[PDB]
Design a protein around this ligand. Structure first.
Ligand SMILES: *[C@@](O)(c1nc2ccccc2o1)[C@H](C[C@@H]1CCNC1=O)NC(=O)[C@H](CC1CCCCC1)NC(=O)[C@@H](NC(=O)OCc1ccccc1)[C@@H](C)OC(C)(C)C
Ligand SMILES: *[C@@](O)(c1nc2ccccc2o1)[C@H](C[C@@H]1CCNC1=O)NC(=O)[C@H](CC1CCCCC1)NC(=O)[C@@H](NC(=O)OCc1ccccc1)[C@@H](C)OC(C)(C)C
Lengths: 306, 306
């Protein structure tokens, strides 16, 4: 019993974090085999940030301009290249702690664990979602650039996020590990803003199923709804449209609880229209939307990793 | 910017988790140097659970009755002893991954990270508090016994919790790593219940300071209050009394924000008396009480570990 925002165990990623220093800029890098990945704006200076041309900036650098530390060990750079917004520093030593890994670009609505790091040393781990507007509501301070987000499937670390920047509203923007930004953001110090966000409907429904699995059941009703009529109510409350694919995803949770997906939609409809009226669900007074259907099944069933 | 429930990086603890099997019972153990710690009810059978005498139960066991697996490696037990409610299995091999560590018994109100494990394999990490009633609101399924809770100070893992049992309300009870239960609970299948809980006042105040550090400031007011008059309002709303020691702890956060502790108490008073009125603090519609003053400073300042 119980339901928590649960991050994946972070050990496999901790063994990959390093410090990358170029000029007066220090940030985190990700050491996998003999390559260190890090945000390319590590080559920027304090006045290069407004409108940098990273191709000129990089063609003016030597390998010895990059100081990479893995713990108290000084890694030598033997090659460098830029891929989109990430820099790849080839080093003379392969990380012996390299886990089985993949680089994956996630869809909005998907969740991942963030290992927050400063100076190549991990600070904390927490769970996030890719918001529909391609920001993440992270917890990041100066020096956290290059911290990564990730998922784990048994033994394989799927890296999906590298941190680059904070936006004026306090939310965060970054890239996949191939350096492609999530959303329209660019690694320039120019006016950018998040875009209006929406609530991840399919995830709210998953969390309601989590609540039922765990014994909260006060929000259910006898009603049902059509997918169409549900989506007309969702638009009103700034919720993402629910697709048939979302319905299908929610199948296992529906089968385990005996609550048809569309019946749980009718319950969400009533929750949207009436509020929660001083009651809580899974210890929240808000409708929670950073658990995927997979997250719920994982935590309510006990899946491990190795 | 941003504020998350942040767990400590879990790698140092992951390298210590093992599987302990005795009879038909499998649970998790903690392998530090050449000793494996685990709940003593691993020696209980399905009918021994109602009122076991662990001293007879243990005096009937041999070392070879204990199957310890560290990954795909089979550790040999060469000695066993009981200390309070934990069993200590001495094994012929010292864990080469043993971190610097301590065993500490925490006070209620203190927080810690839980590495949830099944069959010696970590499943997830999350942050908890010791509730005033000495339960924890965890997320635990069958097989999670022996999962530990912990804090980290730079390089040292302070282990503070080992999981033993779930109580009828879905909350959890366990011991320190020397096997002393937190609270009045006993490792018997007899009627036990949590005891009425209270909100951890000093932590709510810390979290309000977190909100100010992060730019939420709508809940402040010009008022102040005496410690006495605050504590009369806290009793009413089932909050823990605030002591001068709590006030002193909140000093750094007070100094960094320029908001006197008692001024923030006046704000909490107004929040208790008027509710939040459809507004949120740090993305919560509830007054959050599982962040200590130390947690806030750590996350709002960027402390790492190594
Ligand atoms: C990261 O540690 C870092 N620090 C760097 C220094 C040099 C080069 C690259 C660096 O990367 C931090 C992490 C940030 C800091 C606070 N919280 C975080 O997550 N990243 C930055 O400081 C980042 C550096 C620039 C990224 C793009 C290319 C040039 C270098 N800056 C920002 O994140 C700023 N955001 C920003 O400029 O957004 C666009 C914008 C919007 C509106 C007006 C003007 C610009 C942040 C730090 O500035 C604030 C928005 C004021 C918070
Ligand atoms: C742990 O994995 C485990 N499993 C064991 C099997 C044998 C011996 C020791 C074991 O430890 C689980 C973890 C639990 C399971 C679900 N969520 C969890 O956190 N622990 C137990 O199953 C535990 C075993 C007993 C502990 C005390 C000594 C004998 C073995 N049992 C419980 O946690 C039960 N709680 C309980 O009995 O509380 C007292 C009580 C209150 C009211 C009426 C009767 C007894 C749980 C599993 O039972 C429920 C309360 C119904 C949930």
């Amino acid at each position: 019993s119980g339901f928590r925002k649960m991050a994946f165990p972070s050990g496999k990623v901790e063994g990959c974090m390093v410090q990358v220093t170029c000029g007066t800029t220090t940030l985190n890098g990700l050491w996998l085999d003999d390559v260190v990945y890090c945000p390319r704006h590590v080559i920027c200076t304090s006045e290069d940030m407004l409108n940098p041309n990273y191709e000129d900036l990089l063609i003016r650098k030597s390998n010895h301009n990059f100081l990479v530390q893995a713990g108290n060990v000084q890694l030598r750079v033997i090659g460098h290249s830029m891929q989109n917004c990430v820099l790849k520093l080839k080093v003379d030593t392969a990380n012996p702690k390299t886990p089985k890994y993949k680089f994956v670009r996630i869809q909005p609505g998907q969740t991942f664990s963030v290992l927050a790091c400063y100076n190549g040393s991990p600070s904390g781990v927490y769970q996030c979602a890719m918001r529909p507007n391609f920001t993440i509501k992270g917890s990041f301070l100066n020096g956290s650039c290059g911290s990564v987000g990730f998922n784990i499937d048994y033994d394989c670390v799927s890296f999906c996020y590298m941190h680059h920047m904070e936006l004026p509203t306090g939310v965060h923007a970054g890239t996949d590990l191939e350096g492609n930004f999530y959303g329209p953001f660019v690694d320039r110090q120019t006016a950018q803003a998040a875009g209006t966000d929406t609530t991840i409907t399919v995830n709210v429904l998953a969390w309601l199923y989590a609540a039922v699995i765990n014994g909260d059941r006060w929000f259910l009703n006898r009603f049902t709804t059509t997918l169409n009529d549900f989506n007309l109510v969702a638009m009103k409350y700034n919720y993402e449209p629910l697709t048939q694919d979302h319905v299908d995803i929610l199948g296992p949770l529906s089968a385990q609880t005996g609550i048809a997906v569309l019946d749980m939609c009718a319950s969400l409809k009533e929750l949207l229209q009436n509020g929660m009226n001083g009651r809580t669900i899974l210890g929240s007074a808000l409708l929670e939307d950073e658990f995927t259907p997979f997250d719920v099944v994982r935590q309510c069933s006990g899946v491990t990793f190795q």
